[PDB]
């Protein structure tokens, strides 16, 4: 009973957080095996950040300029390389707390947990979604760079995000663990505007299924619709187009509740056209889009 914005247990990721200092800049690093991963902008000063040439800036840096601290102990840096927008610092010791892990580049609409850190130390954990404009609506202050986004499948941590930037609008930008930014963002102190933040339609539908499962049924109507009819409405309300792929992954939720996917789309259509009328769904007065169909199944079944 009850449905909550739930994050993965953060322990496996806490054991990987370290503090990386280069010159006067301190941010977070992710220590897995004998490698520490961090944003390459750790090598920048405030003047460098305007238009930095990272290859040129990295020439003046040696292994001994990167100070890596795990807890209160210093790690010895025996190598350093730049991969896209991340620096990989080879240390002489494998992290004894290295969990089983993968590096995955997620698609927009996918959710993940963020372990927000400062000075290599965790401050908190929350659940995020890669927005369709490739930004994330996080909670990050100066010093949080290098904090990571992840998912967990039983014992394997899939790292998907590393925090790098705060856009002038207060939304966040970052890379996968190979250093490639999500979206068109560049690691530079230049105004970069975000594109349209559309609603993740499949996630809203998954959350309407979670609501039916947990007792909130007022929004269920006597109507049905078609993919094409629904999508005309979704385009009007800046909702992502729904595909047969999205319908397919909603199948187990559709089967559990006995509510066909297209019927739920018609409920969503009326919710878009008429609003909530001062009512709530799962304690929210708006349509929640940061639960994937997989998150709903996991939470509603108790996967550990």
Q: Which of 166, 178, 197, 270 binds ligand LCU (CB under 6 A)?
A: 166
The nearer residue to ligand LCU, 68 or 173, going by C-beta atoms, is 173
* 35 is a site residue for its own copies (CB under 8 A): no
Contact in structure between 232 and 292 (CB atoms under 8 Å): no
213 touches ligand LCU by CB under 6 A? no
Residue 139 binding target from its own copies, ligand LCU, none, CB below 5 to 8 Å by type:
its own copies
- Residue closer to ligand LCU by CB (options 140, 230) is 140
C-beta separation of 114 from 138 below 8 A? yes
Q: Is 50 in the site for ligand LCU (CB under 6 A)?
A: no
Pick the closer one to its own copies by CB: 69 or 224. Answer: 69
Cβ neighbors of 81 (< 8 A, separation 6 or more) are 87, 88, 90
Exposed / middle / buried, residue 197 (Cβ in 10 Å: 0-12, 13-18, 19+): middle
**275: left (phi > 0), else alpha (psi -120 to 50), else beta?**
left
Report yes or no: 122 and 115 within 8 Å, Cβ to Cβ: yes
Q: Cα separation of 116 and 289, whole Å?
A: 21
Instruction: Name the packing angle between helices 293-301 and 201-213 (round to 10°).
Output: 20
Among 110, 144, 158, 225, binds its own copies (CB under 8 A): 144
The answer to whether residue 41 is catalytic is yes
Q: Extract the tokens encoding 88.
A: 């990989």
Of 22, 38, 41, 265, the active-site residue reads 41
Among the listed residues 16, 85, 145, 160, the single catalytic one is 145
The nearer residue to ligand LCU, 123 or 189, going by C-beta atoms, is 189
Q: Which residues contact its own copies by CB under 8 A?
A: 1-12, 14-15, 115-119, 121-126, 137-141, 143-144, 166, 170-172, 214-215, 275-276, 278, 280, 283-286, 298-304
Residues found near ligand LCU in the complex (CB under 6 A): 1, 41, 49, 140-142, 144-145, 164-166, 187-189
């Amino acid at each position: 009973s009850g449905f909550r914005k739930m994050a993965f247990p953060s322990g496996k990721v806490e054991g990987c957080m370290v503090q990386v200092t280069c010159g006067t800049t301190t941010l977070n690093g992710l220590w897995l095996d004998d490698v520490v991963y961090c944003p390459r902008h750790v090598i920048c000063t405030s003047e460098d950040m305007l238009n930095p040439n990272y290859e040129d800036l990295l020439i003046r840096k040696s292994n001994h300029n990167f100070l890596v601290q795990a807890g209160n102990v210093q790690l010895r840096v025996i190598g350093h390389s730049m991969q896209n927008c991340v620096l990989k610092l080879k240390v002489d010791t494998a992290n004894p707390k290295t969990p089983k892990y993968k590096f995955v580049r997620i698609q927009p609409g996918q959710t993940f947990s963020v372990l927000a850190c400062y000075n290599g130390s965790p401050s908190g954990v929350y659940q995020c979604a890669m927005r369709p404009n490739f930004t994330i609506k996080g909670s990050f202050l100066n010093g949080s760079c290098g904090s990571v986004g992840f998912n967990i499948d039983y014992d394997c941590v899939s790292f998907c995000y590393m925090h790098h930037m705060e856009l002038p609008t207060g939304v966040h930008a970052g890379t996968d663990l190979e250093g490639n930014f999500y979206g068109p963002f560049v690691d530079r102190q230049t105004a970069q505007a975000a594109g349209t933040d559309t609603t993740i339609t499949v996630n809203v539908l998954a959350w309407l299924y979670a609501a039916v499962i947990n007792g909130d049924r007022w929004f269920l109507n006597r109507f049905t619709t078609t993919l094409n009819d629904f999508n005309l409405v979704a385009m009007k309300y800046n909702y992502e187009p729904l595909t047969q792929d999205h319908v397919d992954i909603l199948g187990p939720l559709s089967a559990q509740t006995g509510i066909a996917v297209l019927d739920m789309c018609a409920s969503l259509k009326e919710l878009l056209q008429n609003g909530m009328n001062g009512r709530t769904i799962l304690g929210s007065a708006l349509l929640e889009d940061e639960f994937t169909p997989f998150d709903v199944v996991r939470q509603c079944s108790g996967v550990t």
